[PDB]
Amino acid sequence: MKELVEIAVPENLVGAILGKGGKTLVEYQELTGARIQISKKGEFLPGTRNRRVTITGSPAATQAAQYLISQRVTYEQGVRASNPQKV
RNA sequence: GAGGACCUAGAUCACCCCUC
């Protein structure tokens, strides 16, 4: 556990942790007490289309935050790998 | 808070910044 954790979340997947108007992101912050900061649009890790997600706070809060987010991204991937994409 | 900027083939953009 550290006070600042970073994850790289594919761009087409980042909106899942942001949510409508950012209401999900805000939710995870209220629930964990940690601050989640996502890179600005168009800003990705070099040589990729992954947005940088920066989590900060107490070690316990940054770890819960990092876990719920990754869990959230992993949940999404599954649903997207099982179900048909609406268009 | 609300406009805006910044990116958008689809798969959510808060925070920061600007204006009030």
UniProtKB/Swiss-Prot annotation:
Location of the protein in the cell: Nucleus
Tissue: Brain. Expression restricted to astrocytes.
Signal peptide range: none
KH domain span: 2-69
UniProt remark on domains: The third KH domain (KH3) recognizes specifically 5'-YCAY-3'.
Record's function text: Functions to regulate alternative splicing in neurons by binding pre-mRNA in a sequence-specific manner to activate exon inclusion or exclusion. It binds specifically to the sequences 5'-YCAY-3' and regulates splicing in only a subset of regulated exons. Binding to an exonic 5'-YCAY-3' cluster changes the protein complexes assembled on pre-mRNA, blocking U1 snRNP binding and exon inclusion, whereas binding to an intronic 5'-YCAY-3' cluster enhances spliceosome assembly and exon inclusion. With NOVA1, they perform unique biological functions in different brain areas and cell types.
The protein's assembly and partners: Interacts with PTBP2; the interaction is direct.
Disease annotated for this entry: Neurodevelopmental disorder with or without autistic features and/or structural brain abnormalities: An early-onset neurodevelopmental disorder characterized by intellectual disability, motor and speech delay, autistic features, hypotonia, feeding difficulties, spasticity or ataxic gait, and structural brain abnormalities including cerebral atrophy, cerebellar atrophy, and/or thin corpus callosum.
Protein name, entry field: RNA-binding protein Nova-2
Record gene name: NOVA2
